Amino acid sequence: MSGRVGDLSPRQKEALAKFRENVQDVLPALPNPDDYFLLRWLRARSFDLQKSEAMLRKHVEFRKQKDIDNIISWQPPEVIQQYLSGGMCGYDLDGCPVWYDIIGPLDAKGLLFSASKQDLLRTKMRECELLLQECAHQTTKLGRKVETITIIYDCEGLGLKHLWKPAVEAYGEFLCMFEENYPETLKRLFVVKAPKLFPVAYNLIKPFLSEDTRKKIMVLGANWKEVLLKHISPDQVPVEYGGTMTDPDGNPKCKSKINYGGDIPRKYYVRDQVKQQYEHSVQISRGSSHQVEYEILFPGCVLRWQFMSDGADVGFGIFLKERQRAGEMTEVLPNQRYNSHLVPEDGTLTCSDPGIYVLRFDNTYSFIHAKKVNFTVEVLLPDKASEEKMKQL
Numbered sequence: 001m002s003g004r005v006g007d008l009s010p011r012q013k014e015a016l017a018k019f020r021e022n023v024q025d026v027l028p029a030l031p032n033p034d035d036y037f038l039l040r041w042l043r044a045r046s047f048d049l050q051k052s053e054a055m056l057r058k059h060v061e062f063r064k065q066k067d068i069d070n071i072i073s074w075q076p077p078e079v080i081q082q083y084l085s086g087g088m089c090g091y092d093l094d095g096c097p098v099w100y101d102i103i104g105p106l107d108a109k110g111l112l113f114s115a116s117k118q119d120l121l122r123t124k125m126r127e128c129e130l131l132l133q134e135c136a137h138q139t140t141k142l143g144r145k146v147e148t149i150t151i152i153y154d155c156e157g158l159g160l161k162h163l164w165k166p167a168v169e170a171y172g173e174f175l176c177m178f179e180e181n182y183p184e185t186l187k188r189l190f191v192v193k194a195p196k197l198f199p200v201a202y203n204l205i206k207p208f209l210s211e212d213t214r215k216k217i218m219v220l221g222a223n224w225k226e227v228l229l230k231h232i233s234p235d236q237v238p239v240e241y242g243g244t245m246t247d248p249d250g251n252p253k254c255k256s257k258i259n260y261g262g263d264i265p266r267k268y269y270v271r272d273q274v275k276q277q278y279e280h281s282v283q284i285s286r287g288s289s290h291q292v293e294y295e296i297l298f299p300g301c302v303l304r305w306q307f308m309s310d311g312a313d314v315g316f317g318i319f320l321k322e323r324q325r326a327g328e329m330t331e332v333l334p335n336q337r338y339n340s341h342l343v344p345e346d347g348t349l350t351c352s353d354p355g356i357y358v359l360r361f362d363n364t365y366s367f368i369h370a371k372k373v374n375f376t377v378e379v380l381l382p383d384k385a386s387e388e389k390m391k392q393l
């Protein structure tokens with residue numbers, strides 16, 4: 001069977017009955033704990049009564065701690081309302097709400113420098129509650145249960161800026177929240193206009209995604225508009241995404257419903273940087289240098305780093321290769337001096353040729369002694385299945 005209302009095996013039927021008894025004591029503090037609702041928790045844990053109960057009880061505690069009953073009435077900070085991209089727009093052919101995610105022009109640095117991480121995550125929880133409320137409205141209007149959503153995930157403009165570690169970590173917090181609190185709610189997700197970086201970028205968040213969620217991700221190729229119109233009526237899709245919908249004023253992007261992000265004006269910043277810790281720490285003597293070595297064997301990889309120096313600037317560059325001088329190696333990112341004592345540095349490098357990469361901190365120009373550099377480096381790998389998907393498409 002399928003474990004859904006109208007299609008339960010004898011054993012799933014019995015488990016649903018037992019489940020309701022087992023969690024009776026939390027059902028009152030839920031808005032609408034019908035059979036559809038309960039079966040989402042049971043499907044998410046394959047009808048394991050004990051695991052499904054832990055999951056739901058954790059969600060009940062979540063709703064209390066995060067004041068979810070009142071979150072739609074909570075108004076997000078102005079900077080977030082103005083610049084957090086994405087939006088609800090249209091319904092698919094089954095009547096499910098469609099949500100657009102717009103990744104390219106999202107300015108995650110600006111957002112984290114202008115608002116609390118807590119307020120950003122609360123805004124995303126609120127989006128989920130708004131989508132569930134829309135499902136409830138569709139349920140009434142269409143005369144049948146609607147409880148899932150279709151996502152259009154627009155990766156046009158996805159680039160190295162989106163790999164910035166604090167942004168990935170924050171997004172991962174949201175994904176975990178989504179997976180723990182909104183099980184069996186995603187129906188299908190279309191990735192559109194994915195660029196070459198998509199396999200690396202996806203691999204960064206893949207660990208936060210449930211198997212159920214992973215299975216619902218469809219990466220689309222050049223014909224993506226035609227694919228969307230297999231699933232959504234043209235008058236429900238913006239002109240921008242292949243349909244006929246516009247803003248009342250005729251704007252093809254339907255900006256009255258979809259936020260397209262943009263860089264946050266610096267007047268909103270409350271900080272210059274987020275709190276950061278580093279995996280490594282070195283004291284570099286006057287006139288000296290420090291090298292850090294990473295083997296990159298596989299095609300498709302990206303080096304990501306962050307560093308800060310204490311009290312003074314430092315030289316930094318990347319070479320391709322035995323304690324070797326810089327001049328003996330091949331330059332891949334030309335050395336330059338950075339003021340990483342003032343604002344911490346972060347960067348990324350696409351590793352087009354395999355070999356041994358050397359990140360070199362350079363103090364050879366300096367009289368200041370015992371310059372302390374703190375740093376973190378990782379080699380980011382592409383997701384293999386995604387690479388293969390790209391290849392064809």
Ligand SMILES: CC1=C(C)C(=O)C(CC[C@](C)(O)CCC[C@H](C)CCC[C@H](C)CCCC(C)C)=C(C)C1=O
Nearest residue numbers: 108153162163167168170171186201202205213217
């Ligand atoms: C608040 C917020 C922040 C701070 C943010 O950085 C991002 C982009 C995260 C990223 C890692 O920079 C870019 C990640 C790109 C990567 C290709 C994402 C792939 C996502 C998958 C297609 C699954 C999505 C899960 C869905 C079911 C919610 C988004 C979308 C935010 O909303």
